[PDB]
Design a binder for this molecule. Structure first.
Ligand SMILES: CCCCCCCC(=O)OC[C@H](COP(=O)([O-])O)OC(=O)CCCCCCC
Ligand SMILES: [Ca+2]
Length: 784
């Protein structure tokens, strides 16, 4: 490991020239990091011949690029050769077109001649016209090598939580002279469902038919008390085509109940719509490549369809009148199930006799229930509404899924409604300063979605890659990579998971190549920080994660995940410290990369709901109840870059979501072309949205928050978050927490190692190790 390939590797793998029911393929490694594989080409034996374009994104230390030729026959797997090509030949720019050799294990050659042929060419990241330049013009063409292309003429409504009460957001001034206006997710979903006339298409990891979408007594909507299940049956009865694709976890219902069993009522919902006009379909999810035959058998009950989609037809944005319809779609992190309704208040105890009395979510305690009291787990999340042509791309993703894994041939035929539902159309003129350019992205494979291109040439144009048994759409990871690479001022992430780039982890008690969390997001982040230190340019990265991922915090799963997270932070912090040290700067690396979680703490006021019962005596449950504090769960999957570009979707920053062929995901990336930060700072809708989230978490607006690349900003934000952690973790309680953003409770050693905060080996009120524990039982494929 000596040279750094940070950029893009164009490669074509041609043949072997010799040698002496086969299924034969070839893989590309960068030293030990797999970055590509050809298709299994089959019957053909001696001179097997693939010609596969590869567009590879690199952020790797390497001495050699290595091609391995292998045979995967079910009669038995088998390695053939191993070609080397020192990266020295490739760092320069160049176009290495060798007829390189197919060698063996001691590194002398295989049978008697040939010799693999390959074409390579490496572009460092600075070759890209947008590296360190941002979106840089309203002519920006989008992310390349993706299945969906950028759309123009779109409108995006950014959703902070499921609901926002009146008089919540402060005055946040935006470019056109107007103040930021907050939108209401579930209010808008209720209206879109209520008003549909032709189609309603929904996919979820969980749909619970009993939730009511509208609950704010000071913002009442007629019919709002109806449950989503009864709303959909009413709509279907009128003749609207209501199609649902809800994840089928293929565990049967566990009739018994230990009470932070979070269950995806999948059988219950399918049953709820039986005999109605709603067509609900349980949709199984089998991954593409499960590893061992032994490994595959333990894991293939455990991968999910994770897309949260609602698609409806809606009336034409319109003054009057009259006749016609468009398509409107929703994507983000918010499923239509229990535990997801919340507001930025994120109350622990003060809503249990109002909006949460029959929607009590708390899976981190054994046997938590409303009858025993708080704290509930509050739900911070982010969603979006997409109008304009982009809405039809989400609809089309549903159509590909329904055709491959759905039910009867009952998709609404838009060609038959050409006189009612328009073709995919702008909702605004491109000259309107509110207009959005939006592009859809996915993690999905050919086993879950019909209609992917077949020829390897058409696949590579869409950025699709060959899997074990299916073609793979990984445009979500690619969209994150480009969004990070073009970043020039700051990145703000809120995500449920933050772990990956395991090829660059320290071999510390693990064999890194075993982990296979190969997506690049954490490495592109730290490489981006590194490059701005080197240029003397200001840059900051803020990351908001949950205090711990949902579940009992001592459970093997949570502790495994917290250990992956710790190794990812540790690798990043060593990149940043090494770069700082290389400039002879002695600085706090937390002034360049800073990690947060969320928390609440409420005093007990008179007249609060008093539960009848009580947790058991020395439980995590009882401690939390007495300390009056708990985490605010970060379910967000969102990244804001430079106040000008935003990604919202279902995809977590882990290998499960970023791989392509594990869970199925969806996200949108967008910007407003008239509100870029190329020469001014951007002050459009994405800026107002960031400021509203910051107001929610920090409890205040501050001048410094306008420019988060400034040192003054990151410093003020950390300092405040340190004070909130002290308020949070203190045993005494004088007053409510003034904000929610807590410095993530870890310390960074002077060399990058992650250390425990003195006195906080365990999260407050728990016996769960903040630093995580590697599991002996869970395979990395399940937890990364
Ligand atoms: C003992 C509990 C462990 C705590 C963290 C994992 C919790 C979990 O598996 O959550 C369910 C998850 C999808 O739902 P959500 O997490 O997005 O609400 O299903 C997924 O698709 C995500 C799985 C990601 C990695 C964890 C699985 C071992
Ligand atoms: Ca929130």
């Amino acid at each position: 490991a000596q040279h750094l390939l940070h950029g893009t590797l164009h490669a074509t793998i041609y043949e072997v020239d010799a040698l002496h029911e086969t299924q034969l393929y070839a893989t590309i490694d960068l030293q030990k990091a797999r970055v590509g594989r050809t298709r299994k080409i089959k019957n053909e034996p001696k001179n097997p011949k693939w010609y596969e374009s590869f567009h590879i994104y690199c952020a790797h230390l390497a001495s050699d690029i290595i091609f391995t030729v292998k045979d995967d026959n079910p009669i038995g797997a088998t390695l053939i050769g191993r070609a080397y090509i020192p990266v020295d030949q490739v760092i320069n720019g160049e176009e290495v077109d060798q007829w390189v050799e197919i060698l063996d294990n001691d590194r002398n050659p295989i049978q008697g001649g040939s010799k693999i042929h390959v074409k390579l060419q490496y572009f460092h990241v600075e070759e890209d016209r947008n590296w360190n330049m941002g979106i840089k013009s309203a002519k920006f063409p989008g992310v390349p090598y993706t299945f969906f292309s950028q759309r123009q003429g779109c409108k995006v409504s950014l959703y902070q939580d499921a609901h926002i009460p009146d008089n919540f957001v402060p005055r946040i001034p935006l470019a056109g002279g107007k103040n930021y206006e907050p939108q209401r997710c579930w209010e808008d979903i209720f209206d879109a469902i209520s008003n549909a006339k032709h189609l309603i298409y929904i996919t979820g990891w969980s749909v619970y038919a009993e939730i009511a979408l509208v609950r704010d007594s000071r913002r009442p909507k007629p019919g709002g008390d109806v449950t989503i299940g009864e709303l959909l049956k009413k709509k279907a009865s009128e003749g609207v085509r209501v199609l649902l694709l809800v994840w089928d976890d293929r565990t049967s219902v566990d009739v018994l109940k230990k009470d932070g069993l979070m269950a995806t009522h999948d059988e219950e919902t399918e049953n709820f719509f039986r005999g109605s006009d709603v067509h609900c379909i349980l949709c199984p999810r089998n991954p593409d490549d499960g590893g061992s035959i032994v490994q595959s058998l333990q894991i293939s009950t455990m991968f999910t369809h994770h897309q949260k989609i609602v698609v409806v037809d809606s009336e034409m944005p319109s003054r009057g009148g009259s006749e016609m319809r468009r398509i409107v779609s929703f994507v983000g992190g918010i499923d239509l199930c229990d535990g997801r309704y919340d507001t930025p208040f994120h109350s622990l105890f003060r809503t249990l006799d109002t909006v949460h009395h029959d929607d009590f979510h708390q899976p981190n305690f054994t046997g938590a229930a409303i009858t025993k009291g708080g704290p509930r787990e509050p739900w911070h999340d982010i969603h979006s509404r997409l109008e304009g042509p982009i809405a039809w791309d989400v609809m089309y993703n549903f159509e590909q899924r329904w055709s491959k894994q759905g039910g009867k041939d009952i998709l609404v035929k838009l060609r038959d409604l050409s006189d009612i539902i328009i073709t995919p159309s702008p909702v605004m003129f491109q000259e309107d300063h509110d207009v959005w350019n939006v592009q859809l992205f996915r993690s999905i494979d050919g086993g879950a979605a019909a209609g992917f291109p077949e020829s390897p040439e058409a696949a590579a144009e869409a950025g699709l890659v060959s899997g074990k048994d299916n073609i793979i759409d990984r445009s979500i990871q690619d969209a994150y990579i480009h969004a990070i690479r073009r970043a020039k001022d700051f990145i703000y992430v809120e995500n449920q998971y933050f772990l990956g780039s395991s090829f660059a982890w320290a071999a510390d008690g693990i064999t890194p190549e075993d982990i296979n969390a190969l997506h690049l997001i954490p490495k592109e982040l730290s490489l981006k920080i590194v490059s701005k230190i080197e240029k003397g340019e200001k840059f900051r990265v803020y990351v908001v994660v949950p205090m711990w991922p949902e579940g009992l915090p001592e459970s093997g799963s949570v502790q495994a995940i917290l250990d992956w997270q710790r190794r990812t932070m540790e690798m990043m912090y060593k990149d940043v410290i090494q770069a700082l040290r290389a400039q002879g700067l002695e600085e706090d690396p937390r002034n360049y990369l800073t990690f947060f979680c969320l928390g609440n703490r409420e005093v007990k006021k008179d007249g609060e709901y008093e539960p009848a019962e009580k947790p058991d005596p020395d439980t995590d449950y009882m401690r939390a109840q007495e300390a009056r504090r708990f985490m605010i769960y970060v379910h967000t999957k969102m990244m804001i870059v430079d106040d000008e570009y935003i990604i919202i979707g279902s995809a977590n920053i882990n290998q499960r979501s970023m791989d392509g062929a594990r869970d199925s995901e969806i996200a949108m990336g967008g910007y407003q072309p008239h509100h870029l930060s190329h020469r001014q700072p951007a002050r459009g809708q994405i800026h107002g949205f960031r400021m509203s989230l910051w107001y929610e978490h920090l409890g205040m607006l501050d001048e410094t928050f306008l420019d988060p690349s400034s040192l003054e900003c990151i410093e003020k934000v950390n300092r405040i978050s340190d004070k909130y952690w002290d308020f949070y973790s203190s045993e005494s309680l004088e007053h409510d927490l003034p904000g929610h953003l807590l410095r993530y409770p870890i310390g960074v050693a002077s060399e990058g190692d992650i250390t425990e905060l003195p006195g906080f080996e365990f999260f407050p009120d728990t016996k769960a190790r903040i630093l995580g524990t590697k599991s002996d039982y869970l395979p990395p494929i399940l937890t990364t």
